[PDB]
């Protein structure tokens, strides 16, 4: 009836949407549609705010109405693509973006949204190409600039790096001042030189999005247990994770549910992911007191009701802002105590989180300001790994004298029996050494010939590069390998007569400053090499180009492919020293390299993510590997690479202390986690709100 009036109502709705008044936007778009039912722009604009409230099906219905009314409405197609992408319909999203760009070639938002599919598929050069098209058409485009910056970080393109970081910080500042959702993702924010205040505000605004989605449910506050009477004096602990399956989180904590004291604790595991069929999933399902698949319960209201009805005292957030998170569940507060643990190396910034489980080394008291949560300290490190259970063949080793601990390495469950079948095995202060006999030449020939395995004295001797051909489950870490495995520097092109510095982290953890520190070390330690991973492969030529410009020849940096889990951990035995990334430390990869007995040099920063390595080394008991500044990092690394007596001493310390220290003791860890859980409970039950447990 009146397009002009509907049109004013649509514009007013748009102004309200900008101001963050989403409920008022919805009210005004709906009145525009009463005044002009066939108003395509109102259907599409309304669908977008419905998408913000998690009403994806109702959004889809309005987008389809917009396109029914206006078949070449580019905005409706690009907006509908966003809703489909969130519904995990990547195919439909692509059709929508491609259709929006068919219609309007100059549509910056649609190029940026298409870039987001390329990014999410792993196609980073194509994501870069599309983001760059978006920024050429719309130079003021925070979402495209911030996502481009993350793409450039993944592939180690440091073109104009310091000016890039300045514009990132500037965009965040402007979005925080104007009360807009920052275009920098909280998880991504750990890679950029943002103030603690900006990192915490980014987190806080993302946490606050969960409310747009739970507010439309009109759920009242839950009533919480105030004692353990209903649960027989047992504390009900709920572990909420997308990562119960073949995921690093499971490779760290798969043992902890099973190891809880069932006299004091009732363990519930809330999976946000379907069953991926792996032993990781099998074990947590079998060893938890209860296992609830919330992938089956997509409504956060019904899912939260289920947690509340189970009687949970401490609900544990293992995702934070990682893939698969359903922080909406935490936003509804189905549990009286809600704690961040292990999955996310930073603050939620979120009203609905009470505690972050951390430690004095990771999160010292003077940086409490960085976190919205109260600090809950584990006694040594909050970090834990399942290495003792997953990889017990790496508990012991033997070498072939071709005396080096890390040129040719044997590992196996039956290693001692195999060695006892040989007549000429020496020991060293202990390390068994096979001399260059018939057996040794056979083992080496297998490696040089690229053979899968041989038999010696009835014992299966397997090529460490061929584990997936031998036992696919042994390759993933789902089972212990049953053969004796040979690992050699020759398998990876590493020099026999020079120091190997390694870093097995995603390349996005490297910045120019870090590669310059590494170059400084290599130039002080002749013939040494840096061993890095194709993580991903497209990052490799960038690193090489930067390293060559710093004076390092291509042959000083050795790249390997990312390996199946068991080979990645096993081959860390071939390194002399791990050089930790100061920007964001190795977390999982720190535990991995230490389990192989490789010393790791670290420079802790201020962020949780920049201090995990120092916390791991403190728990291990190797303070000599923690640097106070860049000069000290370079000095420690150079000393380990030039003084072979000191190297041997530091390597022995790590080799012994990975067993004797608490670092990999999941039984002691679980016992200390239980102490902390009952201190949180006792504090809540006496009627206190959260406080630091330090």
């Amino acid at each position: 009836a009146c397009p002009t009036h509907a049109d004013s109502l649509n514009n007013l709705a748009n102004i309200k949407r900008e101001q963050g008044n989403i409920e008022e936007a919805v009210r005004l778009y709906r009145k525009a549609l009463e005044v002009f039912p066939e108003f395509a722009a109102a259907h599409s604009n309304l669908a977008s705010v419905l998408q913000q409230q998690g009403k994806l099906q109702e959004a889809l219905m309005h987008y389809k109405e917009a396109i029914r009314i206006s078949p070449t409405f580019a905005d409706a197609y690009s907006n509908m693509g966003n809703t489909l992408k969130e519904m995990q319909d990547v195919q439909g999203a692509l059709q929508c973006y491609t259709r929006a760009i068919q219609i309007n070639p100059a549509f910056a938002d649609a190029h940026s949204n298409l870039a987001s599919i390329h990014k999410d598929s792993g196609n980073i050069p194509e994501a870069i190409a599309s983001y760059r098209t978006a920024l050429k058409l719309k130079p003021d485009f925070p979402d495209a600039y911030c996502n481009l910056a993350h793409c450039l970080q993944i592939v180690c393109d440091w073109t104009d790096y310091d000016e890039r970081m300045k514009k990132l910080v500037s965009i965040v500042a402007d979005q925080l001042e104007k009360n807009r959702l920052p275009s920098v993702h909280p998880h991504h924010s750990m890679l950029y030189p943002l103030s603690h205040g900006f990192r915490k505000a980014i987190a806080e605004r993302h946490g606050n999005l969960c409310l747009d989605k739970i507010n439309v449910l009109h759920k009242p506050p839950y009533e919480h247990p105030k004692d353990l009477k209903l649960s027989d004096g047992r504390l009900r602990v709920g572990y909420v994770s997308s990562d119960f399956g073949n995921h690093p989180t499971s490779h760290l904590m798969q043992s902890i549910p099973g190891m809880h004291n069932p006299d004091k604790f009732e363990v519930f595991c809330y999976a946000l992911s379907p069953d991926d069929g792996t032993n990781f999933r099998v074990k947590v399902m079998a060893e938890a007191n209860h296992f609830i698949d919330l992938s089956q319960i997509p409504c956060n209201g019904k899912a939260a009701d289920r947690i509340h009805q189970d009687g949970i005292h401490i609900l544990v957030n293992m995702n934070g802002y990682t893939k698969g998170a359903r922080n909406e569940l935490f936003a509804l507060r189905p549990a009286p105590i809600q704690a961040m643990w292990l999955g996310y190396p930073g603050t939620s910034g979120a009203l609905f989180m009470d505690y972050i489980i951390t430690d004095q080394e990771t999160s010292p008291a003077e940086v409490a300001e960085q976190y919205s949560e109260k600090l809950a300290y584990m006694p040594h490190t909050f970090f834990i790994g399942d290495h003792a259970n997953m990889f017990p063949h790496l508990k012991k080793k033997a070498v072939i004298d071709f005396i080096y601990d890390n040129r040719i390495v044997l590992n196996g469950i039956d290693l001692k029996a195999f060695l006892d079948s040989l007549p000429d095995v020496k020991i060293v202060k202990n390390m068994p050494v096979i001399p260059m006999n018939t057996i040794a030449e056979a083992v080496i020939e297998m490696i040089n010939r690229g053979q899968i395995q041989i038999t010696i004295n009835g014992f299966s001797i397997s090529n460490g590069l061929a584990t997936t051909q031998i036992n696919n489950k042994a390759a993933t870490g789902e089972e212990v390998p049953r053969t004796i495995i040979v690992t050699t520097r020759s398998q990876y092109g590493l020099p026999e007569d020079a120091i190997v510095y390694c870093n097995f982290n995603q390349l996005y953890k490297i910045d120019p400053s870090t590669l310059q520190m590494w170059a400084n070390i290599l130039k002080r330690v002749p013939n040494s090499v840096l061993w890095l991973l194709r993580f991903p492969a497209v990052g490799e030529p960038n690193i090489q180009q930067y390293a060559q410009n710093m004076g390092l020849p291509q042959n000083r940096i050795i790249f390997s492919p990312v390996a199946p889990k068991e080979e990645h951990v096993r081959r860390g035995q071939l390194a002399d020293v791990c050089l930790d990334t100061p920007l964001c430390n190795g977390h999982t990869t720190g535990m991995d390299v230490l389990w192989a007995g490789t010393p790791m040099v670290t420079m802790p920063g201020e962020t949780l993510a920049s201090r995990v390595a120092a916390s791991q080394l403190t728990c291990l008991g190797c303070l000599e590997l923690i640097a106070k500044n860049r000069q000290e990092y370079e000095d420690i690394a150079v000393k380990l690479g030039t003084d072979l007596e000191y190297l041997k001493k530091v390597r022995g310390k790590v080799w012994k202390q990975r067993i004797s220290s608490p670092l990999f003791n999941t039984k002691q860890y679980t016992m200390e986690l239980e102490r902390l859980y009952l201190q949180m409970w006792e504090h809540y039950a006496a009627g206190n709100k959260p406080d630091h447990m330090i």
Partner: peptide, 13 residues
């Protein structure tokens, strides 16, 4: 997954 950008349509002329 990567965040996307919704386009607010204002109708024109």
């Amino acid at each position: 997954e990567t965040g996307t950008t919704n386009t607010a349509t204002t109708a024109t002329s």
